[PDB]
Amino acid sequence: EKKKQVGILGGTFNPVHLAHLVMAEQAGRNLGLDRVFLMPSYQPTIDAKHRLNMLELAVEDNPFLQIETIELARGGKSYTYDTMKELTQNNPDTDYYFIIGGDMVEYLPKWYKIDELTSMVNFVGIRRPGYTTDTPYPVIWVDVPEIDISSTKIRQKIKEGCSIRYLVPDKVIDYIQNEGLYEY
Amino acid sequence: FLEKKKQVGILGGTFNPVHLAHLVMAEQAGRNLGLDRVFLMPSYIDAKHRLNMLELAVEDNPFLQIETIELARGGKSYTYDTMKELTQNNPDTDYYFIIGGDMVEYLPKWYKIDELTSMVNFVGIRRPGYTTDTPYPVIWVDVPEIDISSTKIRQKIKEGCSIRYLVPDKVIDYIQNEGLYEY
Ligand SMILES: NC(=O)c1ccc[n+]([C@@H]2O[C@H](COP(=O)(O)O)[C@@H](O)[C@H]2O)c1
Ligand SMILES: [Mg+2]
Numbered sequence: 260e261k262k263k264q265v266g267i268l269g270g271t272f273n274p275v276h277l278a279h280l281v282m283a284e285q286a287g288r289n290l291g292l293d294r295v296f297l298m299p300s301y302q303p304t305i306d307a308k309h310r311l312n313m314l315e316l317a318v319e320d321n322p323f324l325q326i327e328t329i330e331l332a333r334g335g336k337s338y339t340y341d342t343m344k345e346l347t348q349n350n351p352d353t354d355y356y357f358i359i360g361g362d363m364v365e366y367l368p369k370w371y372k373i374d375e376l377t378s379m380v381n382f383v384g385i386r387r388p389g390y391t392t393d394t395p396y397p398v399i400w401v402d403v404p405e406i407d408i409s410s411t412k413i414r415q416k417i418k419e420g421c422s423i424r425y426l427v428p429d430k431v432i433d434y435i436q437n438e439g440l441y442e443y
Numbered sequence: 444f445l446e447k448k449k450q451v452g453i454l455g456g457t458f459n460p461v462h463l464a465h466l467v468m469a470e471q472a473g474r475n476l477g478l479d480r481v482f483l484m485p486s487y488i489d490a491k492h493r494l495n496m497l498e499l500a501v502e503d504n505p506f507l508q509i510e511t512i513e514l515a516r517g518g519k520s521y522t523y524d525t526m527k528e529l530t531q532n533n534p535d536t537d538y539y540f541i542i543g544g545d546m547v548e549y550l551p552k553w554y555k556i557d558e559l560t561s562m563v564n565f566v567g568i569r570r571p572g573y574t575t576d577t578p579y580p581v582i583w584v585d586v587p588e589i590d591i592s593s594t595k596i597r598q599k600i601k602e603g604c605s606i607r608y609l610v611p612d613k614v615i616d617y618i619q620n621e622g623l624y625e626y
Contacts, residue, residue: 260447261535296532308517325532328515334491349482349508352449 266295278406285403296327340372417441452481464591482510523555544569
C-alpha cells in the first residue's frame with residue numbers, strides 16, 4: 260500500500276568519502292524520501308568487492324542509507340537504463356529518485372536511452388549556486404552543503420601518505436590501511 | 444485501513460542450472476500462499492552464466508524475479524546476514540523463505556537461526572503425506588513431487604542425454620550456445 264520513495268546515488272565510490280554521505284543523506288532528507296541507496300557501478304580498477312566493503316562500513320550505523328548491489332552482481336558495464344528497468348520491475352511499489360550532480364545534468368542527452376529513462380525515474384539535481392537550474396529534462400532540485408572532496412584527491416592523498424581523517428569515515432580508513440588499498 | 448506489508452517469497456539455491464522443479468516450487472509456493480512476488484536467490488562455474496539462465500527462465504513471468512544480493516557480495520553468504528540486509532533494505536516487507544521440506548528438520552543448525560526466525564517466515568515445500576520432525580512453526584505448501592536435480596541435468600548434458608522439458612527451452616539454448624557443462 261505504501262508507494263516507497265527511494266533515492267539512488269550512483270557512482271564508483273573509489274573510495275566512498277564524506278561528500279558521498281552528505282549528498283545522499285541531505286538530498287533524501289531534504290526531499291523527505293523514505294531511504295537512499297548508494298549504488299556502486301561495476302566498471303565506470305580497484306576490486307568491486309573492496310569498494311562494496313568500504314561502502315557497507317560507511318553506511319553501517321545509519322538506517323537511512325543502504326547499499327544497492329545490483330550493478331555489482333550483474334557485472335559487465337550495465338547502462339543506467341538497464342539497471343532501473345530491472346529495479347523498477349523488481350520493485351513496482353517504488354518511486355526512484357536518481358540523484359545527480361548539477362554539473363552532470365547538462366550531459367543527460369548523452370545518456371543511453373535517456374528519454375526512456377526519465378520515464379522510469381525522477382531525476383534529482385544538486386543545485387550549485389554557480390549555474391542555472393534550467394534544463395529540458397524533468398529534474399527537481401535540492402540544495403546540499405558544498406563538500407568539495409573528490410575520490411581522485413583522496414586516492415593521491417593516500418598514495419602520498421597524507422591525512423584523510425574526517426574526509427573519509429574512520430572504518431573506511433581502517434579498511435584501506437589493513438588492506439593496503441590505493442598504494443597504501 | 445492501515446499499511447499492508449508486501450508479502451515476498453525467496454527461494455535460495457545454486458541453480459546450476461535452474462530447472463523446471465525450481466520454477467514449480469517458486470510458483471506453487473507463491474501462488475498457493477497468495478504472495479505478491481517470489482524471488483529466486485542464487486548463492487555465490489561462472490556466476491554470470493547461472494544469472495543469465497535464471498533471468499532467461501523467468502523472463503516471461505512477472506511473478507518470478509531474481510534476487511542478486513548474494514552474487515554481489517562475492518563470498519560465502521550466511522542466510523542470516525543475507526536476510527539481515529534485505530529486511531533492513533526493505534523494512535516494509537514480510538519475507539517468506541522457501542526451503543525443501545527435507546531441509547526443514549535441519550534448520551536449528553543454521554547460523555543464528557533464532558534471530559533468523561524472527562526475521563522471516565519459513566515455508567516448507569512438501570509432497571502430501573510427507574512427515575518430518577519439525578517443532579518450529581513452518582508454513583507448509585503442498586507441491587507435486589518433481590524429482591529433477593541439477594546434478595542429474597549436468598550429467599545428462601555431459602552424456603548427451605535429452606533434457607527437454609526438464610529445463611526451460613531458453614535455458615537449453617543458452618547452455619548449448621555457450622558450451623556449458625561439457626556439452
Ligand atoms: N513487489 C515486489 O516485488 C517487492 C516488494 C517489496 C520488496 N521487494 C524487494 O525488491 C528486492 C529486489 O531488488 P534487487 O534485486 O535489486 O535487490 C527484493 O530483495 C525484495 O525484497 C520486492
Ligand atoms: Mg492439497
